[PDB]
Each structure stands twice: as structure tokens, then as C-alpha cells.
């Protein structure tokens, strides 16, 4: 008979010995965040469908408006009617409610404050003194259990811990000056170094973002997207599950930072800022890096968002996992064949970046992310076709052969989504048991 | 979904009222009224109730307790429970988000960062492309589930349950002075295009036909520790879930071409709205009891002119079960819950007279909160419909505290949305 799926058993089967899995050489240096395709001047501007060059997201807005007017849910994808096209973009737009400028990247601004002191919740609770009282627990084992429990309350579907590898922290952040209001933020972005110094608490000066040398650990969360909606990529409902999960990421960061602070430690939130989430996720054991560039997890494949919190709280690092992703990506190449911009390489991994958007000096599949971003104005969304077609995004990829777990090699419209299955936060009760957690799962 | 169809009743508010019913001023609640707001701490110092409760939390942590006369495993465990409680409230203002059109509860989306970022698309300025209440009901309920509701229902807006006057603050008062500068402000209905606040009035349009009610499920293991700290923590986390639900859903409704008023614990009486929208039935303890969660579920609501199909009220025997049960009343640590029958006359200023209900003494309830250092919840914990702290911390958990053993019960297809 079919063995009842056991996600915890799967993770124990593929656990590695300690050690960062990312292979590097001497040319590796920390990466300036301005180099990402979203921010770099070489890629930030894209033509709209009339050929006008604009910031990428404004050209993409022009295409969303055109599609609604034409009763479309995506590029050359007719909707049931104009009302349905409108509803998908209303859902997408609303999903972003708790996110600043598509990613919350500015450190120590808006939702991403590096201290809790000014938050309305901290002020309300100040008479209890939780953020001022020294820690009552310093045992990393108990702290790992407490913080992971808090993380699940805070909306993480996956959580892991790693020692902080500074190679993946941006050398300089993209941010705005402290006196600039929101309405001018996109006009006034600047660079600001992220440095490590012998200081007691995370602190920002006029010149630097200063992370203390005691900032030992990073906690990485996986926030699961909805499979039915992502499978509509590159159309509007894939944009909506993306958007809602960015607001879930924000809530997670603030909730968890506040818990850590109220435990007597400091905590730095980040969402899409501060450093490279995929690298942290691999080092924390959530999954393995893939050909498309994303972290593939056993539970969700790549159909999961990442965020992370940095802290001096003593914790037990998790072990990395190797469930064969590298070898499957070597022979699969489905994302590369289906990518509408041919951004994903069909070749082998190298240490040499394809362009300024890649960090050289680490062995990885080198993709052209300017080509990726170029398809977003064309399609009026955030694509996601690579995630949608990845075999690991399918549910029930795992089978048991009587001895051990293995991957099933055989695996290698929008009206119906609106009328079909949904549940709280887009989670799927057919698979939600996979992320149940007991103390045995949280700390060893 | 089969159970809910089996117990659907014919249309009509199931709350029985008489000719004495008047709308209720929010300042009368035990949290805000001057006769109940102040309570002594354990040293005998009279303070605002929540500050006296803070003193008890501090005392408990120092003494290694998770609750009144409940020893923790150690001081570290005691500290962790209160840290989790305090963190849970991150997205909530002054225990409930009650001030309308302040902080997270804005009545227009125009000034929000998300609306400003999306302004070039014009979704909030474009007339609706859908006016069909059937299609709108399916769209908005799908959105409500994305926004974190475990249950969602629609009712026509009964103004009897809208507060006659809200508790709020002046618009330009900063957060740090909010608690000391609370004021009362009328909520009125007028022929105006959009919800609007003047110096004198909170104005809801006469076109505000409907209320969308969400149920936000709490964690059963944690609530079972009532009145101790982990019950407080699931309470707190769900208040922040409520706030995010209201903002997400209001934005979706605005981007569909309609207006939307968030509320959380403000604007009107959630239990009455939830009963009229079919989420559950009112109970002896005073809560809406649902089939899926019993009373172990939080409520929020959004008011809108979006055309919608109202849901049917449900009757699965709660009234007859409460008539003979009395378990919450016997376990209540403050004897706040009556063992008598339902009447139309409130016991004190804190109750709204003129509706048939079990009349409870809610100042007695609030008095227990500084003594126990929490938000109690024993009545919810012991209710048959709802079915140590080290074991909770070491035990089962899942995303947002939801339980995969029961999560299938809230799956939704179009069939059950409209
Ligand atoms: S589609 Fe295939 S090659 Fe691409 S990430 Fe998924 S498994 Fe790897
Ligand atoms: S998001 Fe789309 S364009 Fe970008 S890499 Fe994936 S498939 Fe290609
Ligand atoms: S404990 Fe008994 S009387 Fe009280 S609300 Fe629950 S069922 Fe009704
Ligand atoms: S919360 Fe506690 S004190 Fe209040 S009515 Fe319920 S059992 Fe009684």
C-alpha cells in the first residue's frame, strides 16, 4: 500500500553534513544591490508597447491597462470578459498592500526598521520592559525551538537557521535618505554601504548601515505561493499570488523581529533587501539552488517566496539538504526551453557572471536577468513561467519504494481558477500536513 | 460545506428585538467607559486596566509563572510566552484598531503607499466593470480567503449594530498621545458619494448596503491554556491577522471600483454582524459560535456599496444547547456569565438593551484581566463547541497556527461561495 507521505522523514533522509554547499573561488566579492536588474541603469528602463522608454514598472502598467481594456488576462490571453480582466488586476494590486516599491528593499525605512523603539506596538508595550530586560534564555537549543514556533505563528511555511555568511550580504544597499517622504522615494534612491563593526546594536549613520559583529545568525522563512494561481503564469493570477506573498513576507519580518527583540536580542528585517535570499535559504537547508536560479524546496519546489531576519540570538544552525536537484537540473532544462525571453541558460554552471547582474565567483547557472525583466513590460506582470513549469512545483512528486523516498522521474484557465479551489492564504489542505511541526522537527 | 447547507435557515435577521432598541455608543464598552477603565494592580495601585495587567505580567515573569498561580518551567519560558503575546499585536493599535479612519483603519485608500504606487493603472478611479452581485460575491469571497479569512459571509448592513458614536482621536494627534486624547464622535448615514470624515462626524453613505464578515481562526492548543499566556498569544496574533485582512480586502474592493470601510474591533458589533451573515449563532457567553471552530475564532468586518448576495443565517442548535449547558458560566473565574434565561434588558451600561440575549456582566470579566495578567478566554476554552504550556511550545504547530487535521473543512469552491 502507498506509504503515507512524511515530509520530516524526507528532510532527514537527504540531510547533509555541516558546511556551506555553495562553491566559490577567489574572484568572489560582495555584490552591490544597485546591480540588480530592477535598479541598475542598464536595465531599469524598458519600452512600453508604444515604444516609449519608461521605468520598467510603468511600462508594465501601460500593458495592464491595455489588457483590461481589451478583456485580456495576459499577453494574447483573452479573459471571459472585461470584468474578469479587471478583477485579476484588482487582486494583484491589493496583494501588495504591505510592501514598499516592489520588495521592501530600503533598509531601516518604512516597514523594515532595524530597531523596534519607534513602532506603535513597542511604545504600547514599553511598561513591561521586554525589549529592555536582558535575555532570560541563552541556550541555543531552547531559543531555536522558541523562535521557530514564533516563525510558524508569523506565517512561515518553512523555517531554517544558518550562520550568517557575509558573502551574500550586499556590499551597498539601495535606499533613500531619511528625510525623503514616500511620494519622492523612487526619484531619490541612493546607495549606502552595509558594514560590520564592533557596536552593540544595529545602527544607521549618515554614511553607513552598521551591522554588529555579534550578528551571528540568519533565520530564513519560506512563504508558500498558490499552485493553481502560479500555473496561470505569465497571466494575472500568477501576479496575484506573488503579490499577496510579499505582504505575508512583510508581516513575518515584523512579527519575528518583535518576538526576538522582546526576548532580549536585536533583529534586522529584510524582505527583498540586505542580502541574497536564495543563498541564505540554501545554507539554512530550505532547499537547493536550481537552473532557474531559485531555491527549490521538497514541499513546494520553487513555488515559494523567501524572506530572512538577522540576529545575535544564539541558535542551532540547520543542516543543508541534497535531494538531487543539481543532477535533475543538469538534464531537465524545461524552464530554459519555456522561458519566453530565453533568459535561462541551457549550459553548465560556471564561476563567471553573464553580466553585471550576476555575482561572479560562485558556481551557479548564469542567467541573463536583463532579458527576464524585459518580458515583464511585454506581458504586463512578473511572469513566473519558469516556476510554473518546473516539475518540482507539482504536488505529489515524492514516492516511497518500500525502503526510502525518491523523486518520480516520470514528472520530468483563469475563470476556472476564480471558480475553483481556494483556502486560507491560498494554502492547500491536500498538502498542508507536510508543514506540520513538532519540537523534534525544530531542534535536534 | 454539507453541514452548512443542512442548517441554512430562510432569510431574515435571527436577532429578536423590541421597540426599545437604540444604537449603542462605543464608549460604553468596559474597555473604554470611565466606570470600568481603571483597575487596581496587585500592589493596590489604581491604573488604566491594561497598565495594571502589565504589572502582573512583569510579576509573573520575575516569579517564573505563565499565569495566575501557574508555575512555568522556568523564568525563560515565562518570558517567551509574554514575548510571543506582545509580538502578536504588531499590526494592531491600542488593543483592537477601534479608532475609525486612523492608522490602519483608513476609510479611503487614496493616501496609502500601495494606492500611490498603483495610481497610474487607475483601478481605484475607474468605474466598476462588474455590477452583477453573483459574480462580485464569488470574486470578493475568493479575495477574502487570499486575505486570511478562514470563514467569510455577507449580510445586508443592519444599522442597529453600528455604534451610535465611535471612540477615536483627533486626526493630527500623534500615536504617543493617543491613549490620553480619546474622544467620542458620531457615526451618521447621509446621502453622500463616499465615506467621509468631517470635524464633527464620521459619515457613512446611505449607499453602504452590505457588510462582509470574516472569521479568523485561533489555535486550539494555545487557547486551551486560558487564562495563561499562550491563550493571550493566539489572541494577539489573530488581531494582526484581522488588520491585514481588512486592509487587503478594502484595497481589492476599491480597485474593483467600489468603496470599503475597514473596522476590526471598531464601527459596530461584530457578533451581531457575524450572526446575520451566517457564520454562526450567538451563545450564552456572548460569542458567535461557528460549526468549524465553535467560538474559538476572531471576527472582523468590512462595509461596502459593492453589490453582493447575502448569505443565509444558520441554525445548528446552539440556542437550545446553551439553554441547558451553562459550562462557561460555571467555569468563568469572575462569574460574569449568567446562568439565567435570555431577556431584553441589559445588566449594566456595558450591554445594549432591546435585543433578546444572555445578559452578562462585562465589568466583572474585565476585572479579571489585571488579576490574571492576560485576556482570559476560559469561556472559549471550555465550550464544547470549541472541541501544559511547555507541551504547547514543544508540540504541534503549523502556519498561522492552523491545524492540518481540520483545514480541509474550510476549503472553498464556487458552489459554496455563491
Ligand atoms: S525546470 Fe527543470 S532545469 Fe529548470 S529549475 Fe526546474 S528541475 Fe531545474
Ligand atoms: S520569470 Fe519568465 S522571463 Fe524570467 S526567467 Fe522565469 S520564465 Fe524567463
Ligand atoms: S459553554 Fe455551553 S452554555 Fe456556554 S457558550 Fe458554550 S455551549 Fe453555550
Ligand atoms: S473571558 Fe474569562 S472572565 Fe471573561 S467571561 Fe470569559 S471566562 Fe469569564
Whether the upstream peptide bond of residue B227 has omega within 30° of 0, thus cis, is yes
Resolution of the structure in the document, Å: 1.6
CB under 8 Å to A84, separation ≥6 — which residues?
A71, A73, A414, A415, A418
Measured CA to CA, the distance from residue B129 to residue A180 in angstroms comes to 37
Measured CA to CA, the distance from residue B154 to residue B80 in angstroms comes to 39
CB under 8 Å to B174, separation ≥6 — which residues?
none
Which chain A residues have a beta carbon less than 8 Å from that of B95?
124
Which chain A residues have a beta carbon less than 8 Å from that of B90?
119, 121, 251, 254-255, 258
Nearest Cα residue to atom 8 of ligand 3? B322
Which chain A residues have a beta carbon less than 8 Å from that of B149?
424
Question: How many Cα neighbours within 13 Å face the side chain of B21?
Answer: 17
What's the gap in Å between the CA of A419 and the closest CA on chain B?
A: 5
Q: Give the A:B interface size as CB pairs under 8 Å.
A: 250
Cell of A249: 513576507
> SS3 letters for chain A?
CCCCCCHHHHHHHCECCCCCCCCECCCCCCCCHHHCCCCCCCCCEEECCCCCEEEHHHHHHHHHHHHHHCCEEECCEECCCHHHHHHHHHHHHHHCCCCCCCCCCCCCCCCCCCCCCCCHHHHHHHHHCCCCCCCCCCCHHHHHHHHHHHHHHCCCCEEEEEECCHHHECCEEEECCCCCCHHHHHHCCEEEEEEEECCCCCEECCCCEEEECCCCEEEEEEEECCHHHHCCCCCHHHHHHHHHHHHHHHHHHHHHHHHHHHCCCCEECCCCCCECHHHHHHHCCCCEECCCCCEEECCCECCEEEEEEEECCCCCCCCCECCCHHHHHHHCCHHHHHCCCCCCCCCCCECCCCCCCCCCCECECCCCHHHHHHHHHHHCCCCCHHHHHCHHHCCCCEEECCCCEEECHHHCCHHHHHCCCECHHHCCCCCHHHHCECHHHHCC
Measured CA to CA, the distance from residue A152 to residue A158 in angstroms comes to 8
Measured CA to CA, the distance from residue B275 to residue B294 in angstroms comes to 13
Measured CA to CA, the distance from residue A328 to residue A287 in angstroms comes to 14
> How many angstroms does the Cα of residue A17 sit away from the middle of ligand 3?
53
What's the gap in Å between the CA of B160 and the closest CA on chain A?
A: 31
Cell of B2: 454539507
**How far are the Cα atoms of A271, B212, B288, B328 from residue B325, in angstroms, in the given order?**
49, 31, 16, 8
The helix (run of H) or strand (run of E) holding residue B78 is helix B75-88
Residue of chain A with shortest Cα separation from B252? A94
A152–B399: do the CB atoms touch at under 8 Å? yes
Nearest alpha carbon to residue A214 among A236, A190, A198, A233? A198
Ligand 3: residue of B293, B383, B386 to mutate (most ligand atoms within 8 A of CB) is B383
Amino acid at each position: 500500500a502507498e506509504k503515507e507521505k512524511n515530509a520530516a522523514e524526507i528532510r532527514q533522509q537527504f540531510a547533509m553534513t555541516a558546511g556551506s554547499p555553495i562553491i566559490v573561488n577567489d574572484k568572489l566579492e560582495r555584490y552591490a544591490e544597485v546591480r540588480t536588474a530592477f535598479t541598475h541603469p542598464t536595465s531599469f528602463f524598458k519600452p512600453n508597447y508604444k515604444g516609449e522608454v519608461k521605468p520598467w514598472f510603468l511600462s508594465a502598467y501601460d500593458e495592464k491597462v491595455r489588457q483590461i481594456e481589451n478583456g485580456e488576462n495576459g499577453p494574447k490571453m483573452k479573459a471571459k470578459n472585461v470584468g474578469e480582466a479587471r478583477a485579476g488586476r484588482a487582486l494583484e494590486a491589493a496583494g501588495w498592500t504591505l510592501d514598499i516599491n516592489y520588495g521592501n528593499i530600503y533598509p531601516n525605512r518604512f516597514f523594515m526598521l532595524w530597531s523596534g523603539e519607534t513602532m506603535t506596538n513597542t511604545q504600547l508595550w514599553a511598561p513591561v520592559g521586554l525589549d529592555r530586560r536582558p535575555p532570560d534564555t541563552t541556550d541555543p537549543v531552547e531559543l531555536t525551538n522558541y523562535v521557530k514556533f514564533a516563525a510558524r505563528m508569523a506565517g512561515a511555511d518553512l523555517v531554517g537557521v544558518a550562520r550568517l555568511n557575509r558573502n551574500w550580504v550586499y556590499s551597498e544597499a539601495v535606499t533613500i535618505p531619511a528625510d525623503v517622504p514616500y511620494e519622492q522615494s523612487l526619484h531619490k534612491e541612493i546607495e549606502k554601504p552595509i558594514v560590520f563593526k564592533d557596536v552593540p546594536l544595529p545602527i544607521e549613520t549618515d554614511d553607513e548601515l552598521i551591522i554588529p559583529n555579534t550578528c551571528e545568525n540568519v533565520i530564513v522563512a519560506g512563504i508558500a505561493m498558490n499552485r493553481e494561481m502560479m500555473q496561470t503564469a505569465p497571466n494575472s493570477m500568477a501576479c496575484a499570488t506573488t503579490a499577496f506573498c510579499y505582504s505575508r513576507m512583510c508581516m513575518f519580518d515584523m512579527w519575528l523581529c518583535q518576538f526576538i527583540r522582546y526576548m532580549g536580542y536585536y533583529a534586522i528585517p529584510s524582505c527583498n533587501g540586505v542580502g541574497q535570499s536564495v543563498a541564505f535559504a540554501v545554507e539554512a537547508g530550505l532547499g537547493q539552488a536550481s537552473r532557474m536560479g531559485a531555491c527549490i524546496t521538497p514541499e513546494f519546489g520553487p513555488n515559494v517566496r523567501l524572506t530572512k531576519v538577522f540576529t545575535n540570538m544564539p541558535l542551532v544552525p540547520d543542516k543543508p539538504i541534497d535531494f538531487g536537484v543539481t543532477e535533475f537540473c543538469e538534464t531537465c532544462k524545461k524552464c530554459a526551453r519555456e522561458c519566453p525571453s530565453k533568459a535561462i541558460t541551457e549550459g553548465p554552471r560556471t564561476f563567471e557572471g553573464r553580466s553585471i547582474h550576476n555575482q561572479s565567483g560562485k558556481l551557479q547557472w548564469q542567467n541573463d536577468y536583463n532579458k527576464c525583466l524585459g518580458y515583464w513590460p511585454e506581458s504586463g506582470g512578473y511572469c513566473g513561467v519558469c516556476v510554473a513549469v518546473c516539475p518540482f512545483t507539482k504536488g505529489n512528486i515524492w514516492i516511497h519504494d518500500g525502503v526510502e523516498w525518491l523523486i518520480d522521474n516520470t514528472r520530468f484557465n483563469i475563470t476556472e481558477v476564480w471558480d475553483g479551489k481556494i483556502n486560507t492564504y491560498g494554502l492547500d489542505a491536500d498538502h498542508f500536513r507536510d508543514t506540520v511541526s513538532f519540537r523534534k522537527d525544530r531542534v535536534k
